[PDB]
Paper text:
Alditol oxidases are promising tools for the biocatalytic oxidation of glycerol to more valuable chemicals. On the other hand, certain alditol oxidases (AldO; EC 1.1.3.41) were found to be moderately active on glycerol without being affected by the inactivating semiquinone formation. Three thermostable alditol oxidases from Actinobacteria Bacterium, Streptomyces thermoviolaceus, and Thermostaphylospora chromogena active on glycerol were discovered. The characterization of these three flavoenzymes demonstrated their glycerol oxidation activities, preference for alkaline conditions, and excellent thermostabilities with melting temperatures higher than 75 °C. Structural elucidation of the alditol oxidase from Actinobacteria Bacterium highlighted a constellation of side chains that engage the substrate through several hydrogen bonds, a histidine residue covalently bound to the FAD prosthetic group, and a tunnel leading to the active site.
Residue numbers in the entry:
A (entry chain A): 5 to 228, 239 to 426
B (entry chain B): 5 to 228, 240 to 426
C (entry chain D): 7 to 228, 240 to 282, 293 to 426
D (entry chain C): 5 to 228, 240 to 245, 249 to 250, 253 to 288, 290 to 426
Amino acid sequence: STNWAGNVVYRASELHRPASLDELRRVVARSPKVRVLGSGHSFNEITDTEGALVSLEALPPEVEIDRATGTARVAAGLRYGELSARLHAAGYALPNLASLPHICVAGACATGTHGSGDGIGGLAGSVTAVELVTADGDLVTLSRDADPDRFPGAVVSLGALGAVVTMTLRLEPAFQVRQRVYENLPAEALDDHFDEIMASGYSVSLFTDWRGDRIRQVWVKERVEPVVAALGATPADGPRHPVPGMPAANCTEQLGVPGPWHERLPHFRLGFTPSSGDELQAEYLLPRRHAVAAFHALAGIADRIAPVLHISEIRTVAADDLWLSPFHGRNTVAFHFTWKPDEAAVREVLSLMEEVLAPFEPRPHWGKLFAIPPKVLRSRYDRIGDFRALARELDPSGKFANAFVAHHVLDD
Amino acid sequence: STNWAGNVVYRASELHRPASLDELRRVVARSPKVRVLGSGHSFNEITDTEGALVSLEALPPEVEIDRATGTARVAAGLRYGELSARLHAAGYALPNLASLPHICVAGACATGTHGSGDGIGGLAGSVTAVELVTADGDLVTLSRDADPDRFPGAVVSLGALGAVVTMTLRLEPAFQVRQRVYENLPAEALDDHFDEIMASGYSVSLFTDWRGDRIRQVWVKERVPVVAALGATPADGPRHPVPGMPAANCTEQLGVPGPWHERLPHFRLGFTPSSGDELQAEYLLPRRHAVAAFHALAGIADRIAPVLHISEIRTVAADDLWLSPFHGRNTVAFHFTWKPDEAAVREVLSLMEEVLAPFEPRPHWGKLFAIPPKVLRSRYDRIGDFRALARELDPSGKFANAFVAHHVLDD
Amino acid sequence: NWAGNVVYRASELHRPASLDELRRVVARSPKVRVLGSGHSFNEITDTEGALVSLEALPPEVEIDRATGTARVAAGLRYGELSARLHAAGYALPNLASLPHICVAGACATGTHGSGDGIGGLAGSVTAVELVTADGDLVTLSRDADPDRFPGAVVSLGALGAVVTMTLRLEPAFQVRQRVYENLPAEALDDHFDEIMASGYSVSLFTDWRGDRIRQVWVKERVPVVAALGATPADGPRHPVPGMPAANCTEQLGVPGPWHERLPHFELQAEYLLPRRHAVAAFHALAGIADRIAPVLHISEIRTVAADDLWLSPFHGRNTVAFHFTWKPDEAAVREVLSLMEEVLAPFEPRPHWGKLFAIPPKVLRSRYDRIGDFRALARELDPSGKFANAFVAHHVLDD
Amino acid sequence: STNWAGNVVYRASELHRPASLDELRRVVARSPKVRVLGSGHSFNEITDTEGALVSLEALPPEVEIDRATGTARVAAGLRYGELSARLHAAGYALPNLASLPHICVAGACATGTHGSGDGIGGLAGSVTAVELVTADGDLVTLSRDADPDRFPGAVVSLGALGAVVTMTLRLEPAFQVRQRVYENLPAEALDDHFDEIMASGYSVSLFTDWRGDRIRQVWVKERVPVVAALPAPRHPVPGMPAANCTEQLGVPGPWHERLPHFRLGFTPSGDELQAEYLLPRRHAVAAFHALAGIADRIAPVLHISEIRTVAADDLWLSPFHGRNTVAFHFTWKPDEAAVREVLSLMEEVLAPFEPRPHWGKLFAIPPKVLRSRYDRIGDFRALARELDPSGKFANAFVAHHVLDD
Ligand SMILES: Cc1cc2nc3c(=O)[nH]c(=O)nc-3n(C[C@H](O)[C@H](O)[C@H](O)COP(=O)(O)OP(=O)(O)OC[C@H]3O[C@@H](n4cnc5c(N)ncnc54)[C@H](O)[C@@H]3O)c2cc1C
Ligand SMILES: Cc1cc2nc3c(=O)[nH]c(=O)nc-3n(C[C@H](O)[C@H](O)[C@H](O)COP(=O)(O)OP(=O)(O)OC[C@H]3O[C@@H](n4cnc5c(N)ncnc54)[C@H](O)[C@@H]3O)c2cc1C
Ligand SMILES: Cc1cc2nc3c(=O)[nH]c(=O)nc-3n(C[C@H](O)[C@H](O)[C@H](O)COP(=O)(O)OP(=O)(O)OC[C@H]3O[C@@H](n4cnc5c(N)ncnc54)[C@H](O)[C@@H]3O)c2cc1C
Ligand SMILES: Cc1cc2nc3c(=O)[nH]c(=O)nc-3n(C[C@H](O)[C@H](O)[C@H](O)COP(=O)(O)OP(=O)(O)OC[C@H]3O[C@@H](n4cnc5c(N)ncnc54)[C@H](O)[C@@H]3O)c2cc1C
Ligand SMILES: O=C(CO)[C@@H](O)[C@H](O)CO
Ligand SMILES: O=C(CO)[C@@H](O)[C@H](O)CO
Ligand SMILES: O=C(CO)[C@@H](O)[C@H](O)CO
Ligand SMILES: O=C(CO)[C@@H](O)[C@H](O)CO
């Protein structure tokens, strides 16, 4: 019926839940208009369609680990929670995960979903091949090794190349992670010490309510002195939640307690499992150089942000070569905004935000809200012409192109 | 707002999600009318209230394992999926789980939730102590060792004693379980071999559509073959109890050994339905009336199968818990996962109840039924005892909604 | 003390007439205890150093329309404070039995009325200003000091001398009050909850002679006990036999202003129990009614809502109040209380801090979850133990 | 989001763009607080509101000409760029145009926007009637002919009467205009020859950087040479490209591709602040010299200043109410803090010349004094209360400056 938040009521005629590869290939082939439905953790109409919603949650939850190549072959309908548990048990890990694990692996990689860390990509960077059902109904495989020229536009694809059934991931050895929350770092500390703070851990989040002159929280996640303590931030005495009033229970165990990578790198614990959300979201991704400038630009309109914000989160993400990846050929600073659920009021505040950041050539998070018109947005991605070439090659009728992918990427 | 099936719209004024014991104690105390809210996997008006709905999902998720006594202190908002995973990690298990893990431990035990298994009781049986917030707002502990007279009425409580915050669970060593599905057993094979079948593994499920003369599926889970010999054929790939639904949802089959918490339920940890498209009722009968009852239903299989997804038949050992459906009688379980027409199932239930009447059938407290109070109560010895415990720990009836008033507490 | 069973062993009795003067006295005196009205019955207000009244201070009463709160002199009595609050068209939720009781003295001990959804008077407090042992002002408020403010109000005057308390107000309201005579004692076994909920504030008066509740006072904001066999009173009544009805607030259902209705207007003990033990307790007490009734004027049963104030008797549990206005024979009463505390022990009872009791410390401290937090707040605000007498040392602070 | 400059961040709740009169009238009637948004070419908080910002650029762009009366009925949301090009096509013209065409007609007229020329008023004088949606949502027409007592209040209104949908303009025959730039006139030239200079063309503009005592540039626009006695494409600001500006070097062209300084195609956000003071024309030289005396404080934080002339009108809050006028315009550099210092000073040195500020550009002139400098303000306050008792269309700006006691 709706997206996780419940602001997007899907206008689809039918919701198909194929129980096999064969049953999917039939649904895709016979349907004139398809958009794959993963986890519903998007806030825009990217997943909307007047035709066929198709889930892949009901296919085999394959997770075949090849010990020789250190790579897992895994079902696109599978979520990061499950995938991680299974990978971890077998003694394998991924380099990073998003804020909660209950997010669909293909759905995440489609929109350029990311964690934080200076030397760590968006999650799609771990992908080394896809198999997808084309608009026709047959399996195509695109892999880095085999298809150098085409693979990089395959992964962060807005699910407009077809339905991905199995993604190959490069694995690392399973690892332990400790996480501490520091409170009330002074905002001015960023002006001279931004690079030192975000490098002070494997993955660092800044949380600010854009009220006053203080970074409300700083989450410093280390692979097994703290810099942000030196700079005025006090360690938190107990468990904490990024948002004011929301329970610490939900969140991954903090207070410096080492635990497995997959119960630490996300902000939310394997158990949390919210059936629904009461928030909106927008995230702008800038070149890393514009962090401070951009911080200040936003400091200038904090009086419009703070009223309708739950929390804003600031992260770093290494550059990839993935054509519609927000991290395409530029190390990045992430300006995320978990809003309160008033779309009208957030839409005003986003047009404004987009004006004050415009000098920093900001790319919006494909899954989160934005108002950046196509002309401007397309100019901010070099390889947008090469991706439109691949979408017409693999989907000439534009089966997998709803209004959103047309408007933002495909239409002239 | 609603139950997981969505047939029950809670008519509550407030939905509290306290983040601390203190915050809970304040909400309980100040609210003149409370019903706790766990996982929402009930289908009747048990969890409904005009007063204050109260989750405990927001309290610290304690799983404190005490190696010495081999027990686990666990938060009442926690669900079996999370609890199990954590218990398994530390190298511990429980004896049984329900069909899907993502059910709340306090809400499961509060209704008499159960698996299958000859020598295995309802899940509430692994409970040795409960700490709860009284209608007053203070903590009370009831344990088997400290309160032998009263503890047996406190676990399977319909949440009418107050809000349980922690539950002590006797553990076992973590164990491996293999699972095999068998297809199209002859219905007559039960008549002389029911007990031989249900005992053919640690936990055993019979799934029939109540169409014609076959048992669609038989699931035989073993701690690390009868029904083959009796004319059922091994399934060659993965399978789901209901026709149409995907095998993918379900725990790994084909006799492949796995961890207990990834086998004893039908549904794998990853399957996480946010909503359901079904109703439910389950009748629990003394084991001797298995065949007698099997036939008595077969006599109205023409009114069942129309509005039915699948019916599940299981065994449950006896316990001593006053409102447990397995209260001092080894049990045969007749489960019905209906299709979501409440008006139509209610009519089929009136009937089911009438034909099963001679077997003194106790309904599952969480699932649908229409068995009136007078009759329901007479099927429970220790109903007068529970009514006293409620009055002792909740004189004002704070935790007594119209459901618990009408079925157990009112005269 | 207003009873006269406690002779204050203080060297000096100061009555500062200015904040400045009070601040001086506190600073210069190495041992202080504040004196309200003297409506305690125990050794709580007693000290060998300096008694300090605050009755002479400016009776400030600053009603802030916006937040709907008042700022009032700790020395002010509820009678006086009420009259002023009422004239401005404001009220407090509840008042104790007589208004001529000091506001900071009341809140320090866990003073309370009756009412199912009504707290002790200390719950109406949002902030305190108090002179420390050093002579400077500290403000503790709920808003500004979440962690600490709950130890501060019901304090046993062991943190400093409170000068001004901020109260949350309601709109001023009328109240009617009817006394019913001779309810059957059995009527509580099934209808306790229904009776105590039959008004805004309800009181049960029993002489613990036979099986009758002598009187039941039912106070309503502008019904069960009539139907359960108690008869309406023909004319004005007083809770104690023989004492004149003239002393008591107007009854016979004549609507009146809250402050002329919620109060009713000897030694005293009160035990405060989880509300669920109301009937169980009421029997345990009937089971020694032969030792009570001889030395008793009247006993008063009331209900009080839970709060989060660390040494409130209502700390984290709705409450049934069992009060005993005794005949002034302390030696006799101390025998009765020792037995009473034994029969009531299973109901984990808390004593009214400002009334008599013999519950040993080790036990009394285990019936308060947040004693250690209150002990660390007194050592934070008064490390010298200026405001620590023998009472507060014995019961709460000493190790 | 912001005004064209970006110094004003709109603190509105809703930004509406009605696509019909019906839809506007609905937005107005249901909104308790409204301010219309034109082109955002203001620099103060005149357009600002905590209520409802309402563009009109999405209504029918009507341009209904009556050959008989030689008058056009035009959509308020229309810009001078568009409106001109369509007026011209039909073989009609307006007497004058502001510096660029991409300013909203009703936005222009609401603040008393103007060009240069001795015998031509501010743009608002060409308006003979308005239809506006009241705070109730119904249409009211005020016209000079029908409502003599009230109409003069209605045009230069500060958008405080209602939302103007259609304005009736008096038109002329379409005319050609040539313009020429002369460079470095001596400032002393003005001392005896100001009047002769500003009368030397249809419109004349004097650009000075307020460095020394020269006029950097004199733009002389003639319908189809005095400043020569006392020649150059060129941009009024140092460092900005000439290509942005209308075609000069005496090349004849249509009025609308000429009278503005900036060509139909430019279409730029901005990087400047603005103030303009409008003095009775006789104080030209006295004021020019009074400013030359603090030209040390000005020239630093200045792009360019423009001095122009404007005819008198009878429009109640027109800067040109009952007096021929000399315009001292300043395009400042974007440092509001620095400019607000210079304006307190400028407003003191010009005080004897009874200056009126441009309603659309910056000023620090206190209300009591500003109000004294308009005779008819008492009558505009009586009209606003007549058309908008609840003050739906009155923001902080209009209340502070004009309406509040
Ligand atoms: C609570 C929450 C936390 C979040 N945390 C983070 C975070 O920390 N970092 C971050 O970067 N983002 C984060 N996000 C954003 C989120 O990762 C994106 O919205 C994500 O891309 C949505 O994935 P989905 O599958 O849930 O959503 P959907 O709307 O269901 O799908 C997203 C897109 O993927 C496509 N897709 C899905 N499955 C397939 C498939 N098999 N083949 C092809 N295309 C497919 C769909 O067509 C659609 O276009 C968060 C979102 C939420 C709600
Ligand atoms: C998909 C599905 C699968 C199922 N599988 C099985 C199965 O295999 N076997 C079986 O026997 N049953 C099964 N059931 C039935 C189910 O276990 C019961 O309805 C059970 O009561 C679920 O409780 P809940 O907390 O999830 O729901 P709720 O309606 O929220 O809670 C049930 C009761 O528990 C009480 N409660 C919850 N938390 C507390 C607490 N902390 N303190 C006090 N009271 C509390 C509530 O007040 C309420 O009265 C299943 C149900 C579904 C929907
Ligand atoms: C006739 C009568 C009726 C009563 N009715 C009730 C009733 O209905 N309900 C009930 O609960 N109790 C009742 N009580 C008990 C009485 O209200 C309490 O004992 C109360 O706490 C005493 O207040 P006081 O002004 O007499 O203080 P005192 O006995 O003089 O002092 C008691 C405490 O107050 C402290 N104190 C006083 N002022 C300050 C200050 N400004 N700053 C710091 N500490 C201060 C002292 O330090 C001391 O610890 C009654 C008592 C009597 C005599
Ligand atoms: C680059 C530039 C050049 C300029 N050149 C000149 C110039 O040469 N001469 C000159 O005199 N001024 C000039 N100005 C100033 C400008 O002409 C005035 O500030 C003008 O009033 C603003 O027009 P706008 O449409 O941007 O108004 P806005 O800022 O959008 O709003 C201004 C006022 O118009 C009102 N309004 C707009 N439309 C309506 C309507 N339909 N009904 C009712 N009220 C309405 C608004 O409520 C507000 O009170 C210039 C400004 C800039 C930025
Ligand atoms: O990263 C995200 C969402 O993309 C979350 O951390 C939010 O910041 C809310 O906590
Ligand atoms: O039998 C049960 C227990 O309630 C179900 O979970 C089965 O899968 C039938 O749907
Ligand atoms: O309120 C009290 C004391 O708390 C009553 O006992 C009255 O004094 C009547 O005796
Ligand atoms: O905008 C105006 C008038 O308001 C012009 O003076 C420009 O500054 C020319 O550069």
